Ligand binder design. Structure first.
Ligand SMILES: OC[C@H]1CNC[C@@H](O)[C@@H]1O[C@@H]1O[C@H](CO)[C@@H](O)[C@H](O)[C@H]1O
Ligand SMILES: OC[C@H]1CNC[C@@H](O)[C@@H]1O[C@@H]1O[C@H](CO)[C@@H](O)[C@H](O)[C@H]1O
Length: 293
């Protein structure tokens, strides 16, 4: 059965969007709309192995107290973002494994949806063959360890319909034991249409023994900007996409989710824009305004 069906997705009360919406004087309809929409909660190397367990227990416990399904995004892979706008992650594979153990300890038996490492498999060719294998082994470690929470619905990140081919990504997913997870995620922090991502997802599902997937619809309401290098890096003219739901149009699509948080910068992007992750009220307002809100 679809593990995401049956409770609402958790709205994070402490998101930067919530802070901005509560501070708006006068109240701003675009910030409010965004702030009130459930979005994934991202963890990285700012949450060390020593304490991330508690952080995770707190968030899933709070979601359970709200009768809601929390979505967490794990974004701590070594050589994260290949040293680009979102450089970071843990220094070593040993650190990463310790981090995953602590995350799993904080999950316990609690309900959670886990997006495992946006871009890691799709961007891995920036690494040497040995470092790439190490990376695949770490993602597999995440799947093997996190799925010990029976109530964790785990989706390995699989890029998007214009990155690797369905065949190439399926190979990497199969390398990391996607069969043991619920499946994979698509379009994270990107802008491709839901229709496009469904066709790509159904193709990958066919190559991964009928695995299921989720699509990030946070910013895909108007499709992508014209094809160009960095068209994913704070593009203008984009719109909020479908609000999070399990009422999808794909046979193996468990949900549309907002994985990326609308308003949070993609990076400096060659234009001296805010650091990746920093909330920009203007960007959230633009995304909402472009969706007609
Ligand atoms: O070489 C990386 C490119 C390849 N083409 C597609 C493009 O998406 C990709 O860039 C990455 O895009 C994702 C969002 O889809 C970002 O999260 C990455 O930072 C970026 O490098
Ligand atoms: O998609 C992963 C990265 C790199 N490319 C796109 C960019 O928007 C994204 O940045 C991350 O965004 C999340 C959610 O807004 C933040 O929590 C991270 O700090 C940031 O690196």
């Amino acid at each position: 059965a679809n593990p995401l069906a049956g409770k609402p997705f958790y709205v994070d009360p402490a998101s930067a969007a919530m802070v901005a919406a509560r501070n708006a004087n006068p109240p701003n309809a675009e910030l409010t709309s965004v702030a009130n929409t459930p979005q994934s909660y991202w963890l990285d190397q700012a949450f060390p192995p020593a304490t991330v367990g508690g952080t995770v227990a707190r968030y899933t416990g709070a979601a359970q107290a709200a009768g809601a399904m929390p979505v967490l995004t794990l974004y701590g892979i070594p050589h994260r973002d290949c040293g680009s706008y979102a450089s970071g992650g843990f220094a070593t594979g040993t650190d990463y494994r310790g981090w995953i153990d602590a995350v799993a300890s904080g999950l316990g038996s609690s309900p959670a949806t886990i997006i495992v490492e946006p871009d890691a498999l799709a961007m891995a060719d920036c690494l040497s063959p040995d470092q790439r294998q190490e990376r695949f082994d770490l993602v597999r470690y995440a799947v093997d360890t996190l799925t010990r929470d029976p109530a964790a619905a785990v989706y390995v990140d699989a890029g998007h319909s214009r990155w690797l081919s369905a065949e190439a990504m399926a190979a990497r997913l199969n390398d990391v034991g996607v069969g043991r997870a619920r499946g994979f995620s698509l379009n994270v922090s990107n802008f491709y249409t839901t229709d496009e991502e469904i066709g790509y997802g159904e193709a990958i599902s066919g190559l991964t023994n009928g695995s299921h997937y989720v699509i990030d619809t946070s910013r895909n309401g108007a499709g992508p900007a014209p094809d160009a290098p960095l068209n994913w890096c704070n593009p203008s003219g984009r719109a909020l996409g479908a609000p999070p739901t399990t009422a999808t149009a794909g046979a193996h699509a468990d949900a549309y989710l907002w994985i990326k948080r609308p308003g949070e910068s993609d990076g400096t992007c060659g234009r001296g824009e805010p650091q990746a992750g920093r909330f920009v009220s203007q960007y959230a307002i633009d995304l909402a305004h472009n969706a007609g809100q």
